[PDB]
Enzyme design. Structure first.
Site, PDB file in Angstrom:
ATOM      1  N   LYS B  41       0.686  -1.088   0.119  1.00  0.00           N
ATOM      2  CA  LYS B  41       0.064   0.048  -0.034  1.00  0.00           C
ATOM      3  C   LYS B  41       0.871   1.258   0.027  1.00  0.00           C
ATOM      4  CE  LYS B  41      -4.035  -1.759   0.061  1.00  0.00           C
ATOM      5  NZ  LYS B  41      -3.803  -3.190   0.781  1.00  0.00           N
ATOM      6  N   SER B 271      -2.078 -12.755   3.916  1.00  0.00           N
ATOM      7  CA  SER B 271      -2.569 -12.639   2.465  1.00  0.00           C
ATOM      8  C   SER B 271      -1.446 -13.201   1.779  1.00  0.00           C
ATOM      9  CB  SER B 271      -3.127 -11.239   2.309  1.00  0.00           C
ATOM     10  OG  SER B 271      -1.976 -10.315   2.267  1.00  0.00           O
TER      11      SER B 271
END
Lengths: 313, 313
Positions: B41, B271
């Site tokens: 991100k 993830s």
């Protein structure tokens, strides 16, 4: 390219110019948190293993043993996993659950030694395990293993030289094992031939390098700057390439790391705050006005979430 | 070079070949944990701010507001600090002390919304704050802001193309906002013209992309794979470039991330385990035997120390 395992991906860490420290952008920081296990030690975990392999001291089936739970332990852990070695780390039973979990996650065999004995008890146990079967176990010894400063001479140093286009004038680094400042200084002064100022940083609470160089009684002391101030002169600290020693107190180191986060958007660890505090002091001396100061930031903030770095924040 | 602030240092993340997954080294992972605030991100926090600046929607004195406490919140926080913006993040009062501390460390103004209202209550509050003075506040909206997949098309994608020398055949990525797989796929299929297989990964517990594409009733559900499985089709997910959707369960995602740590020496987040589990399944199909599979690993292990990733380890 594509690295054959995670150990090969060490280094190539970025330089970022500080806006709220120094004078007219003369302070630049090297982000060693961006590494396979997120610290400067990833480089030495990789190279101590590689060199031991090349030397024949580490072979298939032999197991790594060491007495660290810090950045070096985490570094050796990822390297052991990446290259297929069992590793045992000793540490006092009083170690945080979060660090035990991290190390267990990386597949380390944890040996918890008696709380009352601290680091010394862990060092003894590691040595006793190695003594138990010296054909089976290898201790890599970060404070004296020359593969430590050697990787900094081959990687960290040349990265600084290349990213600054040879304009680096000053290197500022906290001293733990001494490997970083030693290797970087050897690279820049000897391989690239530039007469820079090499600045060792240590806690004012345990200023053993300053005391030694001044011929004073060596008096270590407790401090909170994790990763530096071991309380002795390590073999991997080459005093002959140190030009200046700056001392920094624990509170200011902590405050500075917090300023790095909130004012620069840099998730620095505690010793990173210490190193920038020392560099900021030099950067505001007129003699260093036109000089490019490069500062090693050894680790990243999240590794210190249960420490005074965030306590009270 | 020397980055003018930390936001410019995004990306250039390494590719590491897996030894214990895939078949004959056909699975390679991209380590997005190596970024200024340690996740994928960081790229979109940087570019959403840059683009808002270029568009004139973000100006000196205006303040960022958002409703995230996750990787995007941390990304926007470091960028806001690096570029001199105030930032307010809303989140439920029930958020961990460690995450609040991290965000407070980065200088964020925390607005704690009612626990009983969860994420929705935080989203509302952020929207209510923006509505209070739309001349003062800007919400960057990671799920629909095209600057999100655009940075992946300009950076993440070309990095994969260059580091594999154009040999990449398959890209595997968990879908949160969809930006990663969208941008990467646009880069490789459109800018570099290679007809690769783009694989979206989602939890089997909330398989909304699979349900949508099959024309089935969309039925989200709770899962533990942090960062993916938002329970809807985000605007930044371009379904037209998705060739295949793989579902992975929470337990296997967790187990796989742990295998990444202990068997590969890669400090992967949850993830990341999900994405490698999906890629490992494809890698062991004869149709993918000779194909180079590149897998995005969005985050790093230490960000998950208080999660099920390390619980019981």
């Amino acid at each position: 390219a594509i690295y054959a395992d995670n150990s090969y991906s060490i280094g190539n860490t970025p330089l970022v110019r500080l806006k709220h420290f120094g004078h007219n952008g003369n302070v630049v920081v090297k982000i060693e948190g961006r590494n396979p296990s997120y610290s400067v030690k990833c480089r030495i975990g990789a190279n101590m293993v590689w060199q031991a392999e090349k030397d024949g001291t580490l072979t298939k089936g032999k197991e790594i043993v060491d007495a660290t739970s810090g950045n070096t332990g985490i570094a050796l852990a990822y390297v052991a996993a990446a290259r297929g070695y069992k590793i045992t780390l000793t540490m006092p039973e009083t170690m945080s659950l979060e660090r035990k979990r991290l190390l267990c996650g990386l597949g380390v065999n944890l040996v918890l030694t008696e709380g009352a004995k601290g680091a010394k008890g862990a060092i003894a146990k590691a040595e006793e395990i190695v003594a138990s079967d010296p054909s089976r176990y290898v201790m890599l010894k970060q404070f004296e293993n020359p593969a430590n400063p050697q990787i900094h001479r081959e990687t960290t140093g040349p990265e600084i030289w290349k990213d600054t286009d040879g304009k680096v004038d000053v290197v500022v680094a906290g001293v733990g094992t001494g490997g970083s400042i030693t290797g970087i200084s050897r690279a820049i002064k000897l391989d690239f031939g530039k007469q820079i100022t090499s600045v060792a940083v240590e806690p004012v609470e345990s200023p053993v390098i300053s005391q030694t160089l001044a011929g004073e009684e060596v008096k270590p002391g407790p401090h909170k700057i994790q990763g530096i101030g071991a309380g002795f002169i390590p073999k991997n600290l080459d005093l002959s390439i140190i030009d200046r020693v700056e001392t920094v107190d624990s509170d200011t180191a902590l405050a500075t790391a917090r300023r790095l986060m909130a004012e620069e958007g840099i998730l620095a660890g505690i010793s990173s705050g210490a190193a920038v505090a020392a560099a900021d002091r030099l950067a505001k001396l007129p003699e260093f006005a036109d000089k490019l100061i490069v500062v090693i930031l050894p680790s990243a903030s999240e590794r210190y979430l249960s420490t005074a770095l965030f306590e009270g924040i």
